[PDB]
Each structure stands twice: as structure tokens, then as C-alpha cells.
Amino acid sequence: RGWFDILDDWLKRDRFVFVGWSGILLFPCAYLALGGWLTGTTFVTSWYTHGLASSYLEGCNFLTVAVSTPANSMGHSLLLLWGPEAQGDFTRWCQLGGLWTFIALHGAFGLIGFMLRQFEIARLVGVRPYNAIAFSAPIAVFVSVFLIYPLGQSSWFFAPSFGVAAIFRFLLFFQGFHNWTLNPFHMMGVAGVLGGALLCAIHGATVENTLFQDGEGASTFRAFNPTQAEETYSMVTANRFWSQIFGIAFSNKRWLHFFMLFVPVTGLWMSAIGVVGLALNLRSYDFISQEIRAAEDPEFETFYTKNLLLNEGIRAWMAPQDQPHENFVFPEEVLPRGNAL
Amino acid sequence: SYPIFTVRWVAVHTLAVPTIFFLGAIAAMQFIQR
Amino acid sequence: ATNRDQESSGFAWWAGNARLINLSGKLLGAHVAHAGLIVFWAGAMTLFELAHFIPEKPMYEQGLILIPHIATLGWGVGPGGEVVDTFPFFVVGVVHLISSAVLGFGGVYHAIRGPETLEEYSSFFGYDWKDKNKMTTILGFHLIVLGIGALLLVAKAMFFGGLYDTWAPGGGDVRVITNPTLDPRVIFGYLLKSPFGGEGWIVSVNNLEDVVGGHIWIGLICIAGGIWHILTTPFGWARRAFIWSGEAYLSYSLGALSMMGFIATCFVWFNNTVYPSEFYGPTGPEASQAQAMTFLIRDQKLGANVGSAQGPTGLGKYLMRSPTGEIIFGGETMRFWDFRGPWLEPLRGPNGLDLNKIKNDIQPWQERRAAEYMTHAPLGSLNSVGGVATEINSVNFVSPRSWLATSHFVLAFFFLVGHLWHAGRARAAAAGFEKGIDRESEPVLSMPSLD
Amino acid sequence: GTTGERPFSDIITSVRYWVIHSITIPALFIAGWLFVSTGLAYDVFGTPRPDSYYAQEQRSIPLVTDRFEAKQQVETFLEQLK
Amino acid sequence: EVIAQLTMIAMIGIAGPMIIFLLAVRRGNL
Amino acid sequence: KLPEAYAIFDPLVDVLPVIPVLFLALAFVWQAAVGFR
Amino acid sequence: ANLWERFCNWVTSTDNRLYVGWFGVIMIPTLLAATICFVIAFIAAPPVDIDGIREPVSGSLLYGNNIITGAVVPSSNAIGLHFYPIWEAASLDEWLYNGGPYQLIIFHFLLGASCYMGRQWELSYRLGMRPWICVAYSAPLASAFAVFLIYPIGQGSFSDGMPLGISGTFNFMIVFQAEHNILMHPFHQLGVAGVFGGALFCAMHGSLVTSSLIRETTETESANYGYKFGQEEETYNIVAAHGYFGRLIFQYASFNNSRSLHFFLAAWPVVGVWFTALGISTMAFNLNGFNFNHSVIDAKGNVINTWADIINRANLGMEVMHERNAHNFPLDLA
Amino acid sequence: GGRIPLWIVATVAGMGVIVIVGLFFYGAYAGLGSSL
Amino acid sequence: MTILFQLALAALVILSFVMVIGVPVAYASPQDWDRSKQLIFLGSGLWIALVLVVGVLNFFVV
Ligand code: CLA
Ligand code: CLA
Ligand code: CLA
Ligand code: CLA
Ligand SMILES: CC1=C(/C=C/C(C)=C/C=C/C(C)=C/C=C/C=C(C)/C=C/C=C(C)/C=C/C2=C(C)CCCC2(C)C)C(C)(C)CCC1
Ligand SMILES: CC1=C(/C=C/C(C)=C/C=C/C(C)=C/C=C/C=C(C)/C=C/C=C(C)/C=C/C2=C(C)CCCC2(C)C)C(C)(C)CCC1
Ligand SMILES: CC1=C(/C=C/C(C)=C/C=C/C(C)=C/C=C/C=C(C)/C=C/C=C(C)/C=C/C2=C(C)CCCC2(C)C)C(C)(C)CCC1
Ligand SMILES: CC1=C(/C=C/C(C)=C/C=C/C(C)=C/C=C/C=C(C)/C=C/C=C(C)/C=C/C2=C(C)CCCC2(C)C)C(C)(C)CCC1
Ligand SMILES: CCCCCCCCCCCCCCCCCC(=O)O
Ligand SMILES: [Cl-]
Ligand SMILES: [Cl-]
Ligand SMILES: [Fe+2]
């Protein structure tokens, strides 16, 4: 048997941690994305790219550490360690934001590896690959938000930085500049995520409260044998209950579990499409008819106009420090402010 | 009996050993004064 | 050897205290030992507070929740709420801490060495949950103990030195209460007050005579009810309406405690009589009113006619009318015009704030208190950065009123969940399907289809 | 079933395990401690110590504003701290 | 100082596990 | 501040309030000792 | 049999197409009242002086809104927490101006949804079920109480309750972030874990059961026809699904017990949403998110900004602009 | 092979994480990051 | 009595720490059923006495 068939044998051994052909891509890239984040949040600054401290070493805590995006002046440089910016100098690579592209790009290939892993294992064990299919939604989000979005903008600077508070800043940037809450693709995404959590809770609670008495203990967990043939809960009682409480109910267990796949996967795919639009500043920012009316009628006020005033506050108060390379100087007198505050 | 060096062994030590190192770095940082 | 594993008791370790349901003696131990933990905390915590207490800072700048309760009862405090003797705080602290040891001892005794069940050692201490006569007898005794406790507060107020009275002339003082309110039109009128704005149900109690009088009523009511229940057994209608089991009784009490937690949450947030702002800091409404007062004072000192000053909206910048016409402070604090407090009420006339009193009679002590309370509003971060969320680090402050309201909302909420959890379980178990649906007699299967 | 590796419950309760790791764990910890206490992590990664974010009298941030001259820009900001 | 605090809470903290440990040696009624 | 007589016990008083949570933790040390039976 | 007992049998009958029940006796009128008022108000209510400053906000479709911008607007700040039933107004016109529909709707709705929860307990008892579905619903229910009831209580006004509209919700969220830094609060961070994880585990579970459906159909027909309502046998192979998922991660990171798996699905989102509801309810009393503003300073004392300071700049823009005409004094203390 | 009881190793492991965490929370109040 | 009020108190502290560990262990080793029941009796009475002693001495050092 050829050397290829023997390597195949070893890669597909049943061991504690399955490896597979997909592992040659997955494990190096996943470990290095993870490792680069831990390394950067622990030891690396964002002083030269953002004017920010960003590491434990500098006195940040778990919420405020980040591996921050490269400076706007880097454009969309791959920021290779050996490329023209760092010129092989590791220390200068860190200071210029190289760990961001390092993590983003190894993370991208690591996600590819994870999906291939899902295909590989599904094939060997003999199951259908719906789990791989479902993981397309996390991938579409990661690609749309961390890659496509900055590629449409001026630079990687405006991608999300890898940190807790840094992502919160990203959220508020999207409100203030993109009016992203008003975007129907985001709204569908919200529905799919909140709807998914809903399905998760309601399906778990329904099963747990239509169980059959299959043992005599008050702890009902032990009355389940993974190899039993019989359903462990009553589809029929569950159906009656929800039919009479809510008016409709599931009657088909296969549809129910396919729906649980469909809802959040579809939601995340919709949100990814909206962010591709925002890559180009193709926002759902305004309603023209409201703006025409409001411009002419100073007594016309809605919650839509109230929220644009907030956005306008976000943009002017956050821009000088958030986009330090623009050298925005906004004297006190130009800042938008309501009375007193 | 069992093996003691496995793929698993490498996986755990690939994570475990940098984790301890990093923790000692972070502990030391709590005593940095400005 | 009894219960103590899953195979024999029916409950896994993570539900292990359910193994105690029919082991009255070990169960007695658990309750007493847990009472030890409560009394311990009251003791240890008071000593901690006392060790960390600086008498010249306000109590509410020091993270104190228990010393304020002791001070409110008239101990260690003088006029204005100044602390004059810390020894009583020490005594309260030490006596609870000592007492927890004896409770601890008796609880560990009953839980470990004492008899696992009591019903054979004596028919008085032993009980069956289904014995409705015995359960009301225990309820009866505990009602009497509660009525006694309410009358101890009365004893403290009327005979043993009085209570701190934030409303007392001259900035507040300890005061013996000699004429408690007994008129039930006042006392039970509080219970029929609406809980909405300007009314506030029982949270609106604003004088210590009503407070002492209500505890006279409640002490006597609890004592009379205790005797009632010792001597009676539940009527047929009550028998048919309730579930009679250990778990059901638990669930009834969890519902009660939940209700009480939500009430306490609102008490500490709104009421500045039994939670004096001298000790707990201003209420949210109080601090917001104090701001308008502060800048009214400043601007009037500069020469502004504050009564005729039209603000940007057309409403008064400083003063406006509430929707029933009372004169009140303007701006966003218009929502808080139901606020009443001793620093403000001297400016109040029959139509609300009196402009003649505002122009002429504001004393320096009112300006000081308004400035103090404005700058100790109960707003702050979880890491105790005082102020609005956009404030910079500097002031290390979160109001005791926030700590006490937030904690007890969370507690009250989870105890409502516990009520629903145990109440539903007690119903299911009494009817026999708490462990699941019987495959051989699934009730839905014997029902006509819906359509 | 089981994939043949030694059970973790077995290794971590074993004395050979704690013999090896009573040394190795604390040794790694001290190494990480020393990495920072020596000041070495500052120089590996280029992270300012508390005294080297700004020059004494300057209030501007040393932002890199050029792509290909950026490494040289950073080196120039570092010399202006001496 | 903070020494005494930590020495105190070190001793209190060990007290719990000791009880368990002692009863396990003496094959007590855990 | 405590009375000066008791000041030597200040560090002990500082740590007493955490004791009740050690009980909750002790329950788990105990159940591990009995294997969560 | 007497009228009362026939009525009681009907109320609690398990044969009604929709269960009524004693909780339903209150739920039905209160939900109808709230639903009818909401629909009429959303379409046709005139502008409402939400902030009490005689600046009416138009919320209804006939007064120039669309579905996204329309709302039933919260009642006037001048009212605060006072009860404002229709009969307390001099006229319907006054009641509409001051935002009375909002109180009527939210009170009937909270009452009706609490009884919805009790009704879930009640039917589960009549059917011989276990009783805790209602506990799962307590998580969304508590969330509704927080934004319509608790947060107004703590802040002193229903005018700061959540508006009944799409853009009004966004307004509520933005102002909340400015005044409480909710993103930096761990109970909201727990809520996000709850809902992201809930969606994750929803898709995981659906995909693993779908992956391991037993072949019962041909390629022409829907695989859904291989399951028959009421069938005694399971339609998928959980051992196979465990075999796939155990290898994807490792064996013990995978569930073999269906009951444990489904309890986990119930528990994760419910707990997370309990925490986020408790987040709103405790920020209602101004115990706000973590404040790391100017937490890092250098050897001289210069402030070294972190990402927390950048969040604070956005927060400040929200703060200084919201309700731009409503503040006369420099601190926005509620 | 099992010489050392699991419950002992768990408690010791447990108390070791408490201390490291505790230290990190101490550090939020002292030195870098304390605002002081 | 100063230094000796502090000696009563640290006596009390010490005895408490011994009672805290010893009482539960005693109670759950019914091997030492009778041997030990005399000791807790002594310990308990001695504890109550130290508390009383510390309580009166307080009013000579407070
Ligand atoms: C911890 C307190 C406590 C508890 C748990 C009980 C429990 C009990 N009592 Mg006792 N009771 C108590 C204190 C208590 N009592 C005191 C202090 C007194 C003296 C006043 C009495 C006087 C008393 C009498 C006279 C009777 C009972 C009875 C009963 C039984 C039925 C109660 C019932 O139906 O619930 C409540 C259920 C109801 C249906 C009550 C009415 C429901 C409405 C909606 C409540 C609204 C009115 C409310 C009473 C006040 C409004 C306040 C509101 C603003 C919050 C039950 C064993 C009955 C029994 O069987 O006696 C042997 C009985 O007849 N009790
Ligand atoms: C699957 C593993 C894997 C993958 C996919 C990547 C992928 C990447 N790494 Mg990472 N890396 C890895 C492992 C991996 N790395 C490991 C193990 C380490 C530690 C040693 C690193 C350390 C590391 C650093 C330090 C950096 C990267 C960088 C990069 C990026 C640029 C790589 C590049 O240009 O390669 C160029 C090389 C190739 C594409 C391989 C060419 C292969 C041959 C020569 C083709 C010849 C064809 C031949 C004629 C036909 C033969 C046929 C056959 C039958 C024989 C890319 C995202 C850079 C980065 O992230 O910058 C932002 C960077 O700076 N990597
Ligand atoms: C307030 C907290 C509290 C209290 C009072 C109790 C009390 C009790 N539990 Mg519960 N339990 C708790 C929390 C609590 N538990 C938690 C958090 C869990 C989950 C981990 C459990 C899980 C659980 C299970 C699984 C079981 C119990 C059982 C029991 C009972 C017998 C235990 C036994 O034999 O111990 C034996 C243990 C020992 C002898 C070890 C020493 C323990 C002592 C008490 C230490 C005391 C130290 C203290 C400092 C002494 C100072 C004395 C001083 C005053 C002089 C007892 C009444 C058992 C039961 O119901 O029996 C039928 C049982 O099976 N519990
Ligand atoms: C509500 C709590 C409670 C209850 C119902 C019981 C019930 C019982 N205990 Mg336990 N016990 C408790 C608490 C409790 N005990 C505590 C706290 C301790 C530690 C001091 C003990 C220690 C203990 C032991 C060592 C023994 C019992 C025994 C008994 C049984 C008979 C007791 C008897 O008849 O004495 C009658 C009671 C008296 C003669 C004294 C009555 C006067 C009381 C104590 C004064 C009231 C104090 C006041 C209300 C509290 C505030 C004071 C404050 C200023 C400090 C009975 C099952 C016995 C047993 O199980 O037999 C094997 C036994 O030997 N108990
Ligand atoms: C980047 C880079 C690289 C690599 C690196 C790596 C690979 C690293 C790794 C690293 C690592 C691998 C690290 C780790 C660390 C860890 C840590 C830092 C941890 C910590 C943790 C903690 C702290 C936690 C704990 C806890 C808590 C907190 C609570 C709950 C519980 C518990 C216990 C879990 C190289 C060479 C290529 C070069 C270039 C660049
Ligand atoms: C049963 C059980 C349990 C529980 C237990 C409990 C809960 C207990 C309690 C106990 C207790 C509750 C105890 C107590 C104790 C106390 C003490 C022991 C005290 C003492 C005191 C003193 C010693 C003092 C002194 C002093 C003074 C006098 C002054 C100042 C200073 C000082 C503080 C030093 C558990 C869960 C674990 C497990 C199972 C079983
Ligand atoms: C002290 C005081 C006072 C007074 C107080 C009083 C006099 C009170 C009373 C109280 C009361 C007098 C209360 C009561 C309550 C009641 C309740 C809370 C009820 C409940 C009910 C229930 C829960 C029922 C249920 C049911 C039904 C309905 C049907 C069938 C089934 C059952 C039975 C379950 C005042 C404010 C002046 C001031 C301050 C202090
Ligand atoms: C008052 C007083 C006193 C008393 C004291 C006492 C009462 C004590 C107690 C103590 C205690 C009471 C303690 C305990 C401790 C405990 C602990 C230290 C635990 C921990 C735990 C852990 C670490 C866990 C782990 C684990 C396991 C076991 C299993 C599962 C998993 C885990 C990992 C969770 C004295 C004498 C000082 C004198 C002075 C005064
Ligand atoms: C596909 C897998 C890719 C793995 C890549 C590993 C890369 C590690 C090598 C780093 C070498 C940097 C030194 C070169 C500097 C040259 C700069 C210059 O010529 O100006
Ligand atoms: Cl606004
Ligand atoms: Cl204002
Ligand atoms: Fe399922």
C-alpha cells in the first residue's frame, strides 16, 4: 500500500483527539490564532497604531485588552513579518499591528479547517453533513465582518479589534456612523439569533417537562439509556399542550430539528449580507420622506429623528480619538450638545 | 499498562505549558508600579 | 447511613438537601446551623464595618449597610446623625457573633449526632408534614415570636431611648415616641393607598408615630393569630384549596419572601424616614431635587428672578407646576415632585414651593445639604466609581441605597422563581406525576382530539 | 469505549505525575514571572514602560503615518525619548 | 499587616478541609 | 475603628465576614470526599 | 349539576381548542384590552409629550410614521410614576396628549403575560405534565417587566420606559448605554452569552439530529415524511450523533444522555436571560457597568487611553444629545 | 495509579486558582491600571 | 489587667479554633463515642467562661 494510504491510516486513527487530513490545516492555524491573541493581549501595545494601551503588561484588564487593528496608514497590507513594512523585525511587526493580520488570517484558515474537519468526520462515521452546513453561518459572519468590511473601507484600521471593549466600540461605531440598527438585514439577524435562543429554551424545556416516567428516582436523568429505541418524552402530550397554549405546535420531530438549524443559520447569513453593504457605506441610514418633512416642519419629531441626533453626537464626540490619524480638531464650540449637558 | 507519550500528551502540553508561563508573567505584572 | 446516597433517597447529590424532607431531626439541624450563619454574618459584618468606620466621614461614603440600621434605632448617634458613641455598634456586633457559635453548635449537634428523626424522641417536637393540626401549631408559636419581636421595636421607641427621627426639629435627633398612632384609619389606610406616584402604598410612611403604631397593631395581630392557629385546625375550604406537604409549605414561604424582597427594594429606594438620608445617603429623587435647589440658590444669589425665568421649552427653568398645579422644581426633576424631605419642607406652602420663602428664608444649612445630596446621588459603577457612567475615575462611591435595592431585587426575583419551581413540583408530586408521564396511562391519549 | 490512552483520573492522582509536575509547573511560572520582572517582555514586544509613552513635555501620540517608512518612523519616535 | 490578614485567612481556610481529612483518616461518618 | 484593646485583632476582623461562603465551599469538598454519592 | 360547577368544568376543560383556565379568565380580557388599544394607537394616536417639555413626538402611522419609526409613545415625564387611567383625564384629548395609551397597554399587557405564565403551569397540571415550562417563560417575562416596569420605577418615570416601537426600542438602548454603560456590565455580557449560546446550541442540536436521521424515505420525498406523529421509536440515531460530535471535539465534551442534553438546552438561554433581565433591573437603581475611564496613567500621570475610554467618548456623544431640550442643570441624575 | 485521592487534588487545585484570581483582583486596585 | 485581658481573649480565640475542628470530628467518629463527650463538655463550659471573663474585663480596658 502506497505511502499516501499509510499516512491516511495514521491521520484517521481513533484517538482521544482525532486528527485527519483536515487537522494539518486546522491545528496549526487554530493554535496560532489563539496563541497570537493570548500573546498580544498579554504583552503587546496599540500605542503606535491607535494611541491606546491594550495589554495586561500595560495595566489593562480582561475587558479592556485587545489585539488592535493596524494603523490606517498600512492600507490593506497583509503585514507579513517578512514583507516591506516590518522587514523581518518581530518587535517592529508587533508595534505595527502585524498580530492582527496574523490572527485574522490564521483564524480564517483555521475556520476552513474546522469545517473540513466536520465534513471529514461526518464522512468516516457515516452521518449526513448538516453540522458542516450549519457552520457556514459563523464563517460568513467572520468573513463579512473581519475581512470584507475593512477591505471596502480605507484600511484594516476599521475592522474589529480582537478584544471585549474593542468590540463594544465597534458596536457603537456602527450605530453612530452606519445607523446599523435601522438595517433590515441586521433586523433579520436579530430575529434569527433571538429566535434561535427562544427555540433552544422552549425545546429543551418542553422535552424536560413531557418526559415519560422510565425510572423511579426523583432525578429523572438516570432513566435514559442512549441505546433505547423509545422516545424519552411524549411528542403527543407536548403537541397538545402547545396547541392549546399557543394555538399551534410542532407535530413532526424532523421538521422541528431542521427548523432549529434553519433559524439561527439563516439569521447570521442575513446579517452578513448587511455588513457587505456597509463595507461600501451602503447603509440603510435614512428615510428620505421623514427627512423632507422634518426639514420643512420643525414640529415634526419621531423616534427616527431622535436617534439621528444621538448618532450625530456619537460621531462628533468619538471621532477625534477613535480616528487619531485624521487629526480631527473640533473646538468646543462646534460639538453638538443639547441644553446643559 | 499504557503509553505515556501520545498525540493527546502533545495536545495538552501545547496548551498547558504556555498557560502556566503566561500566568506567572501576569502575576508579576500586579507588582508593577508607575 | 440513612438516605445519604441516590439509590436509597431518590435524589442525586445536587438535590441532596431534598434527602432531609422526612428526617425532622437532621432537618432541624440544617435550619439551626443556617440560622447560625445568618447571625454570624450580622456579627462579623458589623465588626468589619466598625473596624473600617471613620466617624467624620458620612456613613454612606464608607460602604456601611448595618451600622445605619443600628443608628436608625437610636444607638450611638446624636443630633444631625453625628456619631457620638461607637460602643453600641461593637456590642451589637459581638453579641451576634458570640450567639452564632451557640446556634452553630446546636445545628451541628442535631445534623450529625442528634437523632435523625424526632418523632420517637418526643411527640411534641416531632411532626408529620401532613398533620394539619401540628403544622398550624408550629405556625402559631412562630407568629407569637414574631408578634413579640414587633413589640420590642415598640419597647425600644417608647421606653428604651427612642428612635432616630430625621424629621425632628433642628436637623434630626433621637426621640422617644410617646403618642404612637393607633387610629386604624391611618394604620390600615396605608395598606389601601395606591402604590403609584404621589401615594406609594406603605412606602410612604413618613413619621415615626405611624411606624410605632403600626408595629403595635402587627404585634397584637401576630400574637392573636398565633393563638388562633394553636387552638384551631384549618377549615374545609382551606383544606380543599391547598397542597399539604413539606415542599408546598416551602413554596408558599418563597412566594412570601419574594413579595417582601420587592417591597424592601422600594422601601430603601424611596423612603427617607426609616432609611434616613443622613445615614443611607439621599434617595434618587432626593438628589435630583437637591440639584435644582442648588442651582436655584446659586442663580438667585447672582440676581436671577427664579419665579419668572422662562426656560428653553417654555416651562420654568427653576419652577413650574405639577399636573395638579403645585409649584415644583423644573427641568427633568419634574418627575420627582412627590419627594418630601426635612431640608425642603420649610420652603413648602399650601400651593407647593413658596416663592417668598425661596427668596428670603433659605438657610445655609439647606444650601449645604442640597449640595451634599446632589453630589452623593445614588449613581455609580460596579467597581464603585461614583457618578454618571461617563464620569472619570476619582470618587470611590456607590450609595448604600443602590447596594441594598439591587441586591434585594435580585434576591426577590430568584425567590419568585423558586416559588414557581417548588409550587409546581409540589402540585405535580401530590398528584403523582412529578417523575414523568406513565406510558401505560398517558392522560392525553384518553382525551378526544382537538380537531 | 476507550481510545487506549491512560485515563486522566489515573495520571493526576498518580505520584509519578505530581513528582514531575511539582517541579515543572512552578518552574514555568517563575520563568514567566522573570520574563516580566527582568524587563525582557518590554523589549521583545516593543511595549512602552510607564516612562516611555511620551517625551517629558510632549502630549502628542507617536502614530505611524506612513506604510513603508513606518518602521523607521517608530525608531525615530524612540530616539526622541532619550 | 496584610501578612496577618492572609495568615489568618490561610488558617481559617485550611480548617474546613482538615475536618474532612481527619474524618476520612479515622474512617468517620462522612 | 475598634476599641484600642481589640485593635490587635483588626486583621482577624477584616477576614471574618467571608467565613459564611467557605461553608458553601466546604459542602463541595465534602461531597467530593464521598464521591457525590 | 349547578351552574357554578358547570362553569368551573368549562373553564378548566382540557377539550377546549385553546385552554382557558383560571389564569385565562384574567389573561384574555387584559390581553384583548392591551392589543386593541395598541393597534388603534399605533395607527392613529396623535403626538405624545413624552418628556413633559411640551414637545410632542409623533408615533402613529397616520401622523407620518412607517412601520419602522412608529411607536406607542411613553407617557409624559410630568406624570412620572403617577397612575393615569382614562378617568383621571379631563378629556380623551388630554389623555392622548400626555401618553395615556402607553400606561393602559403596558399594565394590561404585564398582567396578561404574567397570567400567560400561570396558564402554562395550569394546563401542564391538567395534562399530567411536569410543571416547569412556565419557569422557562419567566426569563422573557422578567425581561419585559424590567424595561416596562422596573426601570421606570428606579428612574422615577414611565417616560423612561421602553417605547412600544421599533425605532423607539433603539432609542431606549442608546440612551441606556450612555447613562449606564450596559455593554460593560457583566449581567448584559451574560445575556449575550445566553442568546449567542442559545442560537449556537439551537443550530448545533438541530444540525446533529438532522445529521443522524434514519433513512426512511427516498431521495424524491421530504425526509420529514420518515417521522410519523406519535411513533414510539426515535427517528434519529443518537449514538451516531454522539459518535460524530465526540470525535469533532472529544468524547466527553459530547452528550450521550438525551435528558441531560435537553436540560442543558433549556438552562443555558434561560439563565443567561435571567441575568440580563436582572441587569436592566439593577441598573434601574444605577448600579452601572464597570467604569475604567482614565484607569491607565503613565509614570508622569498622563492618561493612557484604552478601548474603555473610546467607549466613553461615544457614551458622551449620546449623553449630551439625548433629550436635547429636557435638561436645565448639568447632571442628568435620572 | 490512584495513590493520591481525587478530592484532595481538586481542593488544592481549586485553592490555587482562587489565589491567582484573587491576586488579579488585588492588582486592579494597585499599580498599573488602578487609576491612581 | 490589660496584657491579661488580651490573654483571656487569645485563649478564647485559640479554644474556639480547637472547638471548631474538634467538635465535628468528635461527633462523626462514634468510635471515640464516650472518651470524647467529656471533652466537649469541658470545652463548652470553658468557652462560655472565657466569654464571660472577656466581657467583664472589657469594662476595665475600654
Ligand atoms: C405567616 C402568617 C400566616 C400564615 C401562613 C397563615 C396561614 C393560614 N391561616 Mg392564618 N392568620 C395569621 C397569619 C397567618 N396565617 C394571623 C396573624 C391571623 C390573625 C389575623 C390569622 C387569622 C386567620 C383566620 C381567621 C383564619 C386563618 C386561616 C389560615 C389558613 C388559610 C389562609 C388562607 O386561605 O390564605 C389566604 C387566602 C385567602 C383566600 C385570603 C383572602 C384572599 C384575598 C385576595 C387577600 C386580600 C385580603 C387580605 C387578607 C388583606 C389585604 C392586604 C393587601 C393590601 C396586601 C392557613 C393555614 C383560616 C383557617 O383555616 O383557620 C383555621 C382562617 O379562617 N388565619
Ligand atoms: C497549515 C498551516 C499554516 C498555514 C495555512 C499558514 C498560513 C499563513 N501564515 Mg503561518 N505559520 C505556520 C503554519 C501555517 N501558516 C506555522 C507552523 C508557523 C510557525 C512556524 C507559522 C508562522 C507564521 C508567521 C510568523 C507568519 C505566518 C504568516 C502566514 C500567512 C502567509 C503565508 C505565506 O505567504 O506563505 C508563503 C509560502 C507558501 C504559500 C508555501 C509555498 C509552498 C511551495 C513552495 C509551492 C511550490 C509548488 C511546487 C513547484 C510544486 C510541488 C508539488 C508537490 C507534489 C511536491 C498565511 C496566512 C504570516 C502572517 O500571518 O502575516 C500576517 C507571518 O508573518 N505564519
Ligand atoms: C446552609 C447550608 C447547608 C446545611 C446546613 C446542610 C445540612 C445538611 N445536609 Mg446539605 N448541602 C448543601 C448545604 C447545606 N447542607 C450544599 C451546598 C450541597 C450541595 C453540594 C448539599 C448537599 C447535600 C447532600 C448530597 C446530602 C446533604 C445532607 C445534609 C444533612 C446531613 C449531612 C451529613 O451527614 O454530613 C456529614 C458530614 C460531615 C460529618 C463532615 C463535617 C461536616 C460538619 C458539619 C462541619 C461543620 C464545621 C463547623 C465549623 C463546626 C463548628 C462547631 C462550633 C460551633 C463549635 C445536613 C442536615 C445529607 C443528608 O440529607 O443526609 C440524609 C446528604 O446526603 N446535603
Ligand atoms: C428552634 C430551635 C430548636 C429546637 C426546636 C430544638 C429542639 C430539640 N433539641 Mg436542640 N438545640 C438548639 C435548638 C433547637 N433544639 C440549639 C440552639 C442548641 C445549642 C444550644 C441545641 C442543643 C441541643 C442538645 C445538645 C440537645 C437538644 C435536644 C433537643 C430536643 C429536646 C430539647 C428540650 O426539651 O429542651 C427543653 C428546653 C429548655 C429546658 C430550655 C428552654 C429555654 C430556652 C433555651 C430560652 C429561650 C432563648 C431565646 C428564645 C433566644 C434569644 C436569646 C438571646 C439573647 C441570645 C428537641 C428535639 C436534646 C436531644 O436531641 O436529645 C437527644 C439534646 O440532648 N438540643
Ligand atoms: C503569536 C506568535 C507566535 C505563537 C505564539 C503562541 C503559540 C503562543 C501561545 C500562547 C499561549 C497558549 C498562551 C496561553 C495563556 C493562557 C492564559 C493566560 C490563561 C489564563 C486563564 C485564566 C486566568 C482563567 C482562569 C479561570 C477564571 C478566570 C475564572 C473561571 C475559572 C478559570 C479557572 C477557568 C509565534 C511563535 C509563531 C511567533 C509569531 C507570533
Ligand atoms: C451541617 C453541615 C454543614 C453546615 C454547617 C454549618 C452551616 C455550620 C455553622 C456553624 C457556625 C455558624 C458556627 C459558628 C462559630 C462561631 C464562633 C466559633 C465564634 C466565636 C467568636 C469569638 C472567638 C469572638 C471573639 C472576639 C471578640 C469577643 C471580640 C472581638 C474580637 C474577636 C472577634 C476575636 C455543611 C454545609 C458544611 C456540610 C454538611 C453538614
Ligand atoms: C407595621 C407598619 C405598618 C402597618 C402594617 C400592617 C398593619 C400591615 C398589614 C398587612 C396585611 C394585613 C397583609 C396581608 C396580606 C395578604 C396576602 C399577602 C394575601 C395573600 C393571598 C393569597 C396568596 C391567596 C391565594 C389563593 C387564592 C387567591 C385562591 C385559592 C388559592 C390560593 C389560596 C393560593 C405601617 C404601614 C402602618 C407603617 C410601617 C410599619
Ligand atoms: C468566628 C471565629 C472563628 C471561627 C471560625 C470558623 C467558623 C471557621 C470555619 C472555617 C471554614 C468553614 C472553612 C472552610 C474552608 C473550605 C474550603 C477551603 C473549600 C474550598 C473548596 C474548593 C477549592 C473546591 C474544590 C472543588 C471540589 C472539592 C469538588 C468539585 C470541584 C471543585 C474544584 C469546586 C475562629 C475559630 C477563627 C476564632 C475567631 C472568631
Ligand atoms: C504556509 C505556511 C507559512 C509558514 C511561514 C513561516 C514564516 C517564518 C519565517 C520568518 C522570516 C523573517 C525574516 C525575513 C526578513 C526579510 C526582510 C527583507 O528582505 O527586507
Ligand atoms: Cl433622546
Ligand atoms: Cl434638569
Ligand atoms: Fe431535540
Side-chain angles (χ1 to χ4, degrees), chain A residues 299, chain C residues 313 315, chain G residues 45-57 73-79 84 89 91-101:
Chain A
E299 277 182 291
Chain C
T313 58
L315 293 164
Chain G
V48 168
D49 191 28
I50 178 170
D51 288 327
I53 54 162
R54 314 295 174 80
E55 188 188 308
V57 172
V73 176
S75 52
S76 176
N77 195 47
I79 289 171
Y84 189 53
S91 71
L92 279 168
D93 310 278
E94 173 202 307
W95 189 74
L96 299 172
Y97 183 89
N98 287 279

Side-chain angles (χ1 to χ4, degrees), chain A residues 24-25 28-29 32 78-82 93 101-102 105-106:
Chain A
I24 288 130
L25 178 56
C29 289
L32 290 181
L78 300 171
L79 234 42
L80 310 182
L81 176 54
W82 57 85
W93 188 57
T101 56
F102 184 90
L105 288 172
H106 286 90

Side-chain angles (χ1 to χ4, degrees), chain C residues 2 4 13 16-17 19-20 26 30 101 105 112, chain F residues 24 30-31:
Chain C
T2 310
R4 261 230 205 65
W13 68 270
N17 292 336
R19 305 172 171 172
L20 296 172
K26 297 195 115 63
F105 184 99
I112 299 308
Chain F
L24 177 50
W30 167 53
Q31 278 298 301

Side-chain angles (χ1 to χ4, degrees), chain C residues 28 32 99 102-103 105-107 109-110 114-115 118 121-122 125:
Chain C
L28 174 63
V32 178
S99 294
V102 46
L103 260 11
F105 184 99
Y109 165 68
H110 281 284
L118 303 171
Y121 176 69
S122 83
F125 286 117

Side-chain angles (χ1 to χ4, degrees), chain C residues 190 193-205 266-267 270-271:
Chain C
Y190 279 109
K193 260 161 106 41
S194 162
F196 287 101
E199 300 266 284
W201 193 47
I202 62 179
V203 177
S204 71
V205 69
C266 294
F267 248 106
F270 288 103
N271 183 284

